[PDB]
Amino acid sequence: MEFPDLTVEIKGPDVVGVNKLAEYEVHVKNLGGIGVPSTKVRVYINGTLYKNWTVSLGPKEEKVLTFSWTPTQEGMYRINATVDEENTVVELNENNNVATFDVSVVLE
Numbered sequence: 001m002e003f004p005d006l007t008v009e010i011k012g013p014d015v016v017g018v019n020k021l022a023e024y025e026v027h028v029k030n031l032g033g034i035g036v037p038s039t040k041v042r043v044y045i046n047g048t049l050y051k052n053w054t055v056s057l058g059p060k061e062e063k064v065l066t067f068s069w070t071p072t073q074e075g076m077y078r079i080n081a082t083v084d085e086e087n088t089v090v091e092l093n094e095n096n097n098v099a100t101f102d103v104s105v106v107l108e
Contacts, residue, residue, distance in 0.1 A: 004032030005092040006039055006057065008081040010101040018074040018107050026081055028055060029062035038088040043067065044080045071105040078102050
C-alpha cells in the first residue's frame with residue numbers, strides 16, 4: 001500500500017524594498033517513497049497567482065525552483081506555495097502540501 005507525501009518549501013528575503021527585485025527559492029520534495037508525475041507547484045501572493053510549474057518527483061526526490069518578484073506597491077504581502085491543488089493523488093499528509101511565507105515591502 002504505497003501512498004506519496006509531497007511538500008513545498010519557500011525560502012528567501014522576508015523584507016524587501018518597493019520597486020526592487022527579490023529572488024525566492026522553492027524546494028519541492030517527495031517524502032512518501034513513491035514516484036509522482038501529477039506534481040503541479042503554484043505560487044500565490046495574497047491569493048494572487050504569480051506563476052505555476054509542472055514537475056515529477058520520484059521516491060524521495062527534490063527539485064529546486066527559483067523566481068524573481070518585484071513589489072511595485074508598498075505594504076505586507078504573503079507568499080504561499082501549493083502542490084497538487086487538483087487533488088489527483090491520496091497522500092499521507094494533507095497539511096504538508098502548503099507553505100506560507102510573510103514578506104514586508106517598504107519604501108526605504
